[PDB]
Ligand binder design. Structure first.
Ligand SMILES: *[C@@H]1O[C@H](CO)[C@@H](O[C@@H]2O[C@H](CO)[C@@H](O[C@@H]3O[C@H](CO[C@H]4O[C@H](CO)[C@@H](O)[C@H](O[C@H]5O[C@H](CO)[C@@H](O)[C@H](O)[C@@H]5O)[C@@H]4O)[C@@H](O)[C@H](O[C@H]4O[C@H](CO)[C@@H](O)[C@H](O)[C@@H]4O)[C@@H]3O)[C@H](O)[C@H]2NC(C)=O)[C@H](O)[C@H]1NC(C)=O
Ligand SMILES: *[C@@H]1O[C@H](CO)[C@@H](O)[C@H](O)[C@H]1NC(C)=O
Length: 258
């Protein structure tokens, strides 16, 4: 509730996926109500549904009320009961174990420039079959793992992987009437350098083989298309998911009855 999305989903059918990748374009989207709003782009690696839902989450987030500033920051999240009483951001609760401190969890990232310099958050996650732990690698460098000890439905692998943007509307319009930007703050039709994207839309099967689904095998979700949208774009070497938008204007208030 009060969350809005522009994401794609890969439903595998059974909880057997042994990992996934996400190369996420980094931006510093503006927030209409920064004291409560957030804007992020991430991967969701999951198994189950309802209270049995288990997540492995990683990406960037502009959340001033949590991080202290408007910079996009590397964040992680997990849940083992579909967000009722388990899971937390970064290392705020026992769950994720950091083994390599080369990268800081929560590190401020360099935002991309509109029509200019493009930056990328390359994150790779893979389950270790000998333990059930899910390891995180940022730009090839190991960070740590989500232990199998905190999970139930995802202990043997994931059934669903999702990528894309999400905003959190603290104004209570449901994400339907807030100029809190998603991605770059521009609609995906703008393309490279102007609209944000997610590439390396890959996941791993039980045999360690990378699955790179085509646009045909992904389910697009964007319940507020006037505010935030998604768009596949075939690049020279791989499929791109463009996503985001400027948000929507407030509901017209032209009454002036005395
Ligand atoms: C896109 O996503 C793919 C995901 O697969 C990325 O490529 C892979 O990245 C990971 C992480 O960097 C690499 O993992 C490492 O693999 C090595 C080698 O593993 C092989 O050899 C082992 C023996 O030396 C063997 O045990 C392994 O076999 C097991 O797993 C296979 C699954 O393929 C299964 O079939 C077998 O039955 C076995 O159970 C395997 O053949 C491994 O040694 C590394 O281990 C270190 O890290 C782990 C934690 O992650 C830790 O537990 C270990 O103790 C150790 O410290 C590690 O797992 C993988 O090799 C890459 N694959 C390829 C083909 O390159 C890719 O990088 C992503 N791209 C982007 C852009 O993000
Ligand atoms: C799980 O999914 C894989 C891939 O579709 C399939 O081959 C396998 O038979 C499924 N069933 C079981 C019991 O794992």
């Amino acid at each position: 509730t009060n969350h809005q999305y522009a994401v794609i989903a890969y439903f595998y059918g059974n909880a057997s996926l042994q990992g996934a990748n996400a190369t996420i374009n980094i931006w510093e989207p503006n927030l209409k109500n920064p004291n409560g709003d957030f804007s992020l782009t991430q991967i969701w690696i999951s198994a189950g549904s309802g209270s049995s839902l288990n997540t492995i989450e990683a990406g960037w987030q502009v959340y001033p009320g949590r991080t202290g500033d408007s910079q996009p920051r590397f964040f992680i999240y997990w849940t083992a009961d579909g967000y009722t009483s388990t899971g937390c951001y970064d290392l705020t609760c026992p769950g994720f174990v950091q083994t390599n401190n080369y990268y800081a969890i929560g590190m401020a990232l360099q935002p991309s420039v509109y029509g200019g310099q493009q930056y990328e958050l390359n994150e790779s996650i893979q389950r270790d079959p000998a333990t059930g732990n899910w390891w995180l690698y940022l730009w090839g460098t190991v960070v740590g793992y989500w232990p199998a000890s905190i999970y139930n439905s995802i202990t043997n692998g994931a059934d669903t992987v999702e990528w894309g943007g999400e905003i959190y509307d603290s104004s209570g319009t449901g994400g339907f009437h807030t100029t809190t930007q998603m991605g770059s703050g521009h609609f995906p039709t703008e393309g490279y350098g102007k609209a944000s994207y997610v590439r390396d839309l890959q996941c791993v099967d039980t045999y360690g083989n990378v699955i790179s689904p085509t646009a045909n095998s992904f389910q697009g979700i964007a319940p507020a298309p006037n505010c935030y949208n998604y768009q596949f774009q075939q690049g020279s070497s791989e499929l791109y998911l463009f996503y985001g938008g400027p948000g929507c204007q407030a509901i017209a208030h032209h009454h002036h009855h005395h």
